[PDB]
């Protein structure tokens, strides 16, 4: 699959075996001013996260865009 990858948005092929994309977020000490921190990448199985983090996996090419891109 292809997925979006942090740190400076690009779309790349995941290694064989990885058939999902993920979006992982979490607050920071600067969350109210700056917003959540977001991480994007490839995954073989959806990553387990810590109780203070959130994750959402998908399975279609480039399905995890940064919510601030170029389009519409």
Q: Whose CA is closest to 1, among 57, 49, 55? A: 57
CATH number at residue 8: 2.10.60.10
Backbone angles phi, psi at 51, to 5 degrees: -55, -35
For the chain, the domain total comes to: 1
Q: Tell me, what DSSP letter sits at residue 67?
A: T
What does each C-alpha distance from 31 to 25, 40, 58 come to in angstroms? 11, 18, 25
Boundaries of domain holding 43: 1-72
What does each C-alpha distance from 16 to 5, 13, 25, 40, 67 come to in angstroms? 16, 9, 25, 18, 26
Task: Count helices and strands (H / E) in the chain.
Answer: 1, 5
- Burial state string for 17-34 with b = 16 or more CB within 10 A and e = fewer than 16: ebebbbbbbeeeeeeeee
Q: Is 48 exposed, middle or buried (0-12, 13-18, 19+ CB in 10 A)?
A: exposed
Lookup: tokens for 68: 């601030």
Cα distance between residue 46 and residue 67, in whole Å = 20
């Amino acid at each position: 699959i292809t997925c979006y990858k942090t740190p400076i948005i690009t779309s790349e092929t995941c290694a064989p075996g990885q058939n999902l994309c993920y979006t992982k977020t979490w607050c920071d000490a600067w969350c109210g001013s700056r917003g959540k921190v977001i991480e994007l990448g490839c995954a073989a199985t959806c990553p387990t996260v810590e109780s203070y983090q959130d994750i959402k996996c998908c399975s279609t090419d480039n399905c995890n865009p940064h919510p601030k891109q170029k389009r519409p």
